[PDB]
Amino acid sequence: VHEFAKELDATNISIDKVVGAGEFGEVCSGRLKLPSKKEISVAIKTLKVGYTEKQRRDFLGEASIMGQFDHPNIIRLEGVVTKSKPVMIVTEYMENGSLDSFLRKHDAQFTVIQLVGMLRGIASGMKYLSDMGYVHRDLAARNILINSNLVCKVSDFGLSRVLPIRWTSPEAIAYRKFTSASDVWSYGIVLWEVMSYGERPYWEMSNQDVIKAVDEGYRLPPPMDCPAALYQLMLDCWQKDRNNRPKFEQIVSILDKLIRNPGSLKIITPSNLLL
Ligand SMILES: Cc1ccc(O)cc1-n1c(=O)c2c(c3c(N)ncnc31)CCCC2
């Protein structure tokens, strides 16, 4: 852990409030005083009292992964507290929380260009992640955090590995073939989530039907008022043949173009799912 994460002094951390319930203990918001004396807002994951040796390793395991990344679209690790209790992971604070819950509060309230900006940030973060040889395996709108300026950043490195059915590519579901191309599939689902303002992918379909339908060639339908360019990008991310999916670099380039001329987004697009 300490190879990649600074040990922070607990005297430099203030706890303001409990803000959520994580897998391993509550999440708080607070402040961190840096060595330069600058004070920043932080999010603080705590490890529950009475944790096992195993829970502690898996908890801190995420920090070991997060700490290897330094990118504007990947949640920044400020450090860990292990020498006192509770054990903590301290990250940059993201005022607007998880992207799916944020978008659900604002159905149809953002411009296409604003949504594209969010999507471009996520793609850029994933381009960096894939460049470092990590497959996220849990790329979903609920695992993207969004700040006060609407910048989106990849979070939740709990399932991440060095090289969730609704978000997983067919081949990864079929035989655990996880590659950066399976993350690209997940990115296509996130793209659908964003353009749908946080609608649940495949709604409440039974998992075996999600698995069978996607395998048969069915895809999520275009969200209401979705630009053709963005729906096509979803379909490209969802190619059955993983070698035909775009790379994250190409996705970033595609979105950089749509951001560049919103007069591209003017063309708008028997079963729920489409064949
Ligand atoms: C604190 C934290 C550490 C690691 C990680 O993967 C995610 C988080 N984290 C979080 O787990 C959460 C939030 C959050 C936030 N608002 N800002 C920064 N990190 C955060 C707010 C929503 C509730 C969960």
- Of 91, 92, 129, which is best to mutate to test ligand 1, by the most ligand atoms within 8 angstroms of its C-beta? 91
Nearest atom in ligand 1 to the alpha carbon of residue 22 is: 11
Among the residues of 10-97, which ranges form H helices? 53-66
- Please enumerate in sequence order all residues whose Cβ is within 8 A of that of 253, keeping only pairs 6 or more positions apart, or say none: none
Is residue 27 part of an annotated ligand binding site? yes
Token pair 């969730």 is at which residue?
164
Fold observed for domain 1-94: Phosphorylase Kinase; domain 1 (3.30.200)
| 9 catalytically annotated | no
Cα distances (Å, whole numbers) of residue 212 to 174, 208, 216, 244: 11, 6, 6, 21
Residue 26 marked in a binding site: yes
Measured from CB, residues less than 6 Å from any atom of ligand 1 are: 19-20, 22, 27, 43, 45, 62, 75, 89, 91-94, 97-98, 145, 155-157
Atom of ligand 1 nearest to the CA of 157: 6
Could you tell me the CA-to-CA distances from 181 to 118, 123, 138, 211 in Å, in that order?
A: 21, 13, 13, 18
* Documented resolution in Å: 1.7
3-state secondary structure 112-139: HHHHHHHHHHHHHHHHHHHHCCEECCCC
Q: Are 219 and 239 in contact (CB under 8 A)?
A: no
Query: What residues have CB less than 8 Å from 168, skipping those under 6 apart?
Result: 137, 182, 185, 186
User: Among 42, 75, 104, 149, which residue has the most ligand 1 atoms within 8 Å of its CB, making it the best to mutate?
Assistant: 75
Which amino acid belongs to residue 221? P
Q: What method did the depositors use to determine the structure?
A: X-ray
Give yes or no on whether 1-94 and 95-275 have one common fold: no
Distance 18 CA to ligand 1 centre (A): 12
Domain residue limits, the chain: 1-94, 95-275
The class level of CATH for 95-275 reads mainly alpha
